[PDB]
């Protein structure tokens, strides 16, 4: 443990990891973000469809000179793609969280994903041969992935401060007479 900042109550949450996964950091960033906050159940059906090319993943940061597709209109976006290998890695972590939730005794029907965070694993070095006797790095850009599923809880009641009110002699001359005067 020690995940990234979460704000969720661990008593109603379960969680999962991959570290050093050989998936593209950038693609799986975009798909992770696409699932983020979703009903765990709506999220899984969703990734399934991506894999079917029936809906897509909006690319929002790492996306310059990406293609264009109708399947982004859903999301207000023109550039969206269908990152297979990301999706399968992510849904694998999701499947894991599920299992752990089941184990903690949490109600599945309330599970939404309340944290999903990819960042950059150590790079993996391979190399390519360029013209005129030269050599260049040829590099894997892998990812750590972490997610957290949590049971939805409704409402929040109320309750907070009181702000101790403070007003001059003349400020309560008005008031003391505001009611003595009228109602």
Partner RNA sequence: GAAAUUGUUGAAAGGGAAGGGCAUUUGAUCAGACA
Partner RNA sequence: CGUGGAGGUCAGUGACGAAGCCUAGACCGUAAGGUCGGGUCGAACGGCCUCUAGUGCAGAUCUUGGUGGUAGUAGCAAAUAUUCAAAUGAGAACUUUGAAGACUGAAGUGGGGAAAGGUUCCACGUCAACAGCAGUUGGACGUGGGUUAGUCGAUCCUAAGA
Partner RNA sequence: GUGAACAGCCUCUAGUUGAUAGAAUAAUGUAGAUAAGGGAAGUCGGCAAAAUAGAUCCGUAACUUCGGGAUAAGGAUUGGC
141: β partners: none
* Partner whose binding site includes residue 163, from RNA, Mg ion, none (CB under 5 to 8 Å by kind): none
- Asked if 36 and 113 touch (Cβ cutoff 8 Å), the reply is yes
Q: Does 138 bind RNA (CB under 7 A)?
A: yes
CA distance 144 to 138: 20
Site string for Mg ion, 10-49 (x = CB under 5 A): ---------x----x-------------------------
| Structure-block tokens of residue 132 | 């005129």
By a kind-dependent CB cut-off of 5 to 8 A, residue 126 interacts, out of RNA, Mg ion, none, with RNA
Strand partners, 121: none
- By C-alpha distance, which of 143, 122, 141 is closest to 19? 143
Report the alpha-carbon distance of residue 151 to residue 111 in Å, rounded: 4
Q: How far is the CB of 169 from RNA (least distance, A)?
A: 18
List residues near RNA by CB under 7 A. Answer: 4-5, 7, 22, 24-27, 29, 33, 36, 61-66, 115-120, 123-124, 126, 128-129, 138, 140-141
Summarize as ranges the residues that interact with Mg ion (CB under 5 A): 19, 24, 62, 65, 77-78, 128, 133, 144, 166, 181
């Amino acid at each position: 443990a020690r995940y990234g900042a979460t704000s969720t109550n661990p008593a109603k949450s379960a969680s999962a990891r991959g570290s050093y996964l050989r998936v593209s950091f950038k693609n799986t960033r975009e798909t992770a973000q696409a699932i983020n906050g979703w009903e765990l159940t709506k999220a899984q059906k969703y990734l399934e469809q991506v894999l079917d090319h029936q809906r897509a993943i909006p690319f929002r940061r790492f996306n310059s000179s990406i293609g264009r597709t109708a399947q982004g209109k859903e999301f207000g976006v023109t550039k969206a793609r269908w990152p297979a290998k990301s999706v399968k890695f992510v849904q694998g972590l999701l499947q894991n969280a599920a299992a752990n939730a089941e184990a903690k005794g949490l109600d599945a029907t309330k599970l939404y994903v309340s944290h999903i965070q990819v960042n950059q694993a150590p790079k993996q070095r391979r190399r390519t041969y360029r013209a005129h006797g030269r050599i260049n790095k040829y590099e894997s850009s892998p990812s750590h992935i972490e997610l957290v599923v949590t049971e939805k809880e409704e409402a929040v009641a109320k309750a907070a401060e009181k702000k101790v009110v403070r007003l001059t002699s003349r400020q309560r001359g008005r008031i003391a007479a505001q009611k003595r005067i009228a109602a």
